[PDB]
Amino acid sequence: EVQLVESGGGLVQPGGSLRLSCAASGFTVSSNYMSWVRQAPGKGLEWVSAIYSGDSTYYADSVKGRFTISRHNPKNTLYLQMNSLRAEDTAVYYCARLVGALTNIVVSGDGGAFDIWGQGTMVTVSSASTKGPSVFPLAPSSKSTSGGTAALGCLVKDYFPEPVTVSWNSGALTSGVHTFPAVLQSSGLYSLSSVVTVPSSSLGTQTYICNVNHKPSNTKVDKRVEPKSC
Amino acid sequence: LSRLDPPEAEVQIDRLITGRLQSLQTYVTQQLIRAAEIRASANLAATKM
Amino acid sequence: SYELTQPASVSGSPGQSITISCTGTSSDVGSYNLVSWYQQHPGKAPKLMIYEVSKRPSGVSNRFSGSKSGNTASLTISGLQAEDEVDYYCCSYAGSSTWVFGGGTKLTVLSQPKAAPSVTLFPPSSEELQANKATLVCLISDFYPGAVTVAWKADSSPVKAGVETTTPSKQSNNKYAASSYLSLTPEQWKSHRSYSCQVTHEGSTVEKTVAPTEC
Amino acid sequence: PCSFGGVSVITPGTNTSNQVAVLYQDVNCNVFQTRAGCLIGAEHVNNSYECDIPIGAGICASYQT
Amino acid sequence: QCVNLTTRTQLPPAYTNSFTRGVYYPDKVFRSSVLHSTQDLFLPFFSNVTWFHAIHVTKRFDNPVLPFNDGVYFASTEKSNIIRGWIFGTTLDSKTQSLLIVNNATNVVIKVCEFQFCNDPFLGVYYHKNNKSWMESEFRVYSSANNCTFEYVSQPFLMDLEGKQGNFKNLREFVFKNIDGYFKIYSKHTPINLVRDLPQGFSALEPLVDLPIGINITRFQTLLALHRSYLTPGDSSSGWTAGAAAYYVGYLQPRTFLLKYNENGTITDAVDCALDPLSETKCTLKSFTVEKGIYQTSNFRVQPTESIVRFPNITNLCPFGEVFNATRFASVYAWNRKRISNCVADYSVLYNSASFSTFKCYGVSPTKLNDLCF
Amino acid sequence: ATRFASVYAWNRKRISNCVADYSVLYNSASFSTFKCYGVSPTKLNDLCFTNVYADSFVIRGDEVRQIAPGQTGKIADYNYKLPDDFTGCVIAWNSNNLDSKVGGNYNYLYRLFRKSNLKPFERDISTEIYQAGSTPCNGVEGFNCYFPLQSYGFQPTNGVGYQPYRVVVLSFELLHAPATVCGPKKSTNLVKNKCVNFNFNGLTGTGVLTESNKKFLPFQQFGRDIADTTDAVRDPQTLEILDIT
């Protein structure tokens, strides 16, 4: 029940704004923790969002006049009206926790223990428009059938911008699923993969549905993965 | 106070003390000078009355 | 835009002790204290293992520790296992309840069994040929150490035009991943005889040879 | 500024007694306010007696019944 | 650490008022038939002091570890020389140079060394039954003495070591002081004869000796002894008989007194300046009896209840790394000019990136620069 | 002599009841810095000092000029406190032959900084830590806090400012009590009922010596009359009291 859930994801264009949200469940945000860690894979990170309510002088000398945010305690949800979003802010944030000093966890000590996070949202600020992903069913081959374990999937290719989420059989296939991250093309396009190692006897008899979802473009494709039936 | 530490500002404080003490001694002298002037005048007015 | 010095590449044998640091300045030497160390399997939200440098997290194995002096550092990671090949950061103060921290020390655990790269090569689908497109989907999984260079052989010919390979990404079994793509046209797909995808993983080579549809 | 007002003491001498009275000059306060100031330690009376210690504002004190 | 002690009925304390004590000879200046005042650590008149009960006949042995405030006055109403020891120290773990004063059965030992201490050190004497013998049996003071700095041993003498119970017959007046690290002792024996709390009256205080110590004193303790006889159950950790004692402790304040001297130059009358409005009047004209009138006094002063700081909302940081050894600077004839404003500056941050050689701020002390707003 | 202590654990020595001199300081070793604050070196043997305390340590030359009564600094603020009204002398001298190892000196330690302020004549015995601003770290060899004690790097290949200077401060008082630390001038006969010059433990003057008429406690030295000048003096040897006229 107690969980931080990110919501309010959509497409942002240069000159526009969007209202993000981190909703706590179980514990009310009136007397709880919220730390907005901004992560870019491979490099260092930064904690930026300075909103501890009461509205006094506490800010960081890097985002002056850019990140504006409000407080709503009783609703157990916080909204992030991140105005003037720059195109160089491609990162998935996480709202998290900390530890102070008051209660039984610390009677003598300092604190500072981020311990409960969210799952993040996928918001891309791109000058160009969003494009629907192209799903190409990668069919099993003769070697996969004769090898005992068949490899099949559906390549998501030439979609801009991110993201694309691939699920199998609407959650009815979990064993062997492995998702290969998107590639950065020279032209800026993306291509990811999703391969599940299935029994070779289930080819044709068991239907293989891959659900490809792209939220900013609002496209859902339920692609069928079929064997090579010439 | 906000302009030097006590050691070296002490010499400027000494000049401040000296000038103000001498200003007081001049002022008190002049006050008693006029007091003595009014002394004889007040005895004079008492003699008239 | 604010970024502090950390040793990015750190490595240690299992059962040993390694030291992790993150840089500050003289405005951070008098008497503060705020340092909490991170842990990230790449690609998802972090994990808490060390905070309150020399004191006790609630539920955490006590094999990890930290130590504090001057310009001489330690996040002391001891008792290394196969699951410690993860990203690390610290936390720190910036004055008046502000914050800053370091640049992501990445730990790599050695003394692990080397596994051959499992390569699967997928030719483009029939309706993709109907779509006037061709894509050679090479998928390399379960390889460690992750130093792979994807090579393409179009009838024993190295082709580099249209080759795009992902960066090595950590998998579930303590190994890395790769997904390479060669984008060609159906005219160039049915002209050549065979197509092979090869990798050079620690000297070892695993090749997958596919052929266009017979019918 | 803050510290602004005069503090005054009255005594008939150690040979008489040891009790005294306390006077303040520029204060808006056994209270007895005068033009000279606010006095404590002397019960103001409506009687008439010849002055012995100059207190101010035409008021004087004494050690009497 | 060490042994513990039990059967301690710790009762609530009682506050009792004092009467005209704490006036001593301040310095070397002999004064005869002349009045004088000085500003020094003294004792105010009529102060509410705390008295600790020590009667066992009951079941009370109390010696709290009070931090050493500047200036200590001690007054013990004894009958059988119960108090014998004092300890000075801050940690008491054989690393602090601790000072032990003890009125030993043979000598008066003053020892400055590295003693390791227990919770409640004390002394104890056992009384035999076949013969009337008194001798120091239990010495539970220190555990180890490795590093030493000072030793003094008095003459070998014998006391009665009484174990009687009754009324108070002797008064010991002591002053414990810390000047430049020294320890001045003003001891006075007084032939008193009462049963309970301190009586009135006044006499001069006779300084005893200035111990030339220089070690820190932050905490102190006054020690006590015990009696062991047939009345005890037969042990020392729970069976103990103290007797009946009474001592008064008072923290000293930066006071000023006017002193009276006769033709024999002896302290006879002392008067305060700040105890009542009359005190300042008496010590202003340098007499005791003043003629009828009114005299000038000081004026009312108001202590600031708060001390606030009011600065504008500034968060920008002055870049001084570019000012000090960034990449390259210009020559002297074409001197390099840089403009800095709207940020916070500091001088203690100048000693991190590079150690400087000459640093002279003309007219301005380096310690105050952050306290002014340039 | 053989070896001295560090500065944070400053070595303390007690000296009294003997004759002291300054001209004898230039025989066993030639000194480098010799500054007696407030007191000229030529007069020291002419006054009669009390309770000599010697505080000895060894420091780097980069901080030798900083030790002085009233300034600030790394060592002057958090390792020792020289009082401003204090009267004494400080002597510093380089020692390469014993405090300079080829591999470096590691036995001695030094505390650059401390948590709180100091009070005069204080020694700290805590390894507590220096840690940025407020909310301490408590310190176990890690980064962006500061363990107080580091080690020196004295080698003979270091610079002049990186040389081990033994620093000893001599502390005393004057005109406060009967002294016993005074010097090599010899006494002579005692003349009474004459207008002569006199000397008692450095106290000079001219006057008439007469017999006293009061009981004095046996620890008093000089009495001062209403003019604050000395009118009563205790004899250094016979311990008799004489009046000055």
PDB file of C-alpha atoms in Angstrom, chain E residues 40-43 67-73 175-182 216-218 220 250-254, chain F residues 119-120:
ATOM      1  CA  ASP E  40      37.482  40.908  42.055  1.00  0.00           C
ATOM      2  CA  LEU E  41      35.780  37.529  42.516  1.00  0.00           C
ATOM      3  CA  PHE E  42      33.992  37.891  45.857  1.00  0.00           C
ATOM      4  CA  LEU E  43      30.924  36.634  47.735  1.00  0.00           C
ATOM      5  CA  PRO E  67      31.459  21.830  37.435  1.00  0.00           C
ATOM      6  CA  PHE E  68      34.071  24.334  38.557  1.00  0.00           C
ATOM      7  CA  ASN E  69      32.607  27.799  38.146  1.00  0.00           C
ATOM      8  CA  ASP E  70      35.080  30.644  38.601  1.00  0.00           C
ATOM      9  CA  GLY E  71      35.371  31.143  42.356  1.00  0.00           C
ATOM     10  CA  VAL E  72      34.402  28.724  45.138  1.00  0.00           C
ATOM     11  CA  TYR E  73      33.603  29.469  48.787  1.00  0.00           C
ATOM     12  CA  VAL E 175      38.348  29.697  49.407  1.00  0.00           C
ATOM     13  CA  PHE E 176      39.096  27.837  46.167  1.00  0.00           C
ATOM     14  CA  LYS E 177      40.272  30.194  43.426  1.00  0.00           C
ATOM     15  CA  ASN E 178      41.660  29.992  39.890  1.00  0.00           C
ATOM     16  CA  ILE E 179      43.833  32.941  38.821  1.00  0.00           C
ATOM     17  CA  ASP E 180      46.221  32.440  35.869  1.00  0.00           C
ATOM     18  CA  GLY E 181      45.952  28.721  36.740  1.00  0.00           C
ATOM     19  CA  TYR E 182      47.007  29.200  40.369  1.00  0.00           C
ATOM     20  CA  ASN E 216      42.935  23.261  33.978  1.00  0.00           C
ATOM     21  CA  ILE E 217      40.092  22.955  36.481  1.00  0.00           C
ATOM     22  CA  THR E 218      36.622  22.460  35.003  1.00  0.00           C
ATOM     23  CA  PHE E 220      35.830  19.530  41.218  1.00  0.00           C
ATOM     24  CA  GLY E 250      28.921  29.000  47.135  1.00  0.00           C
ATOM     25  CA  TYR E 251      29.857  30.174  43.655  1.00  0.00           C
ATOM     26  CA  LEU E 252      31.694  33.510  43.617  1.00  0.00           C
ATOM     27  CA  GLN E 253      30.762  36.529  41.511  1.00  0.00           C
ATOM     28  CA  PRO E 254      32.708  39.511  40.112  1.00  0.00           C
TER      29      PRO E 254
ATOM     30  CA  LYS F 119      40.566  29.015  27.378  1.00  0.00           C
ATOM     31  CA  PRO F 120      43.989  30.026  28.747  1.00  0.00           C
TER      32      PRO F 120
END
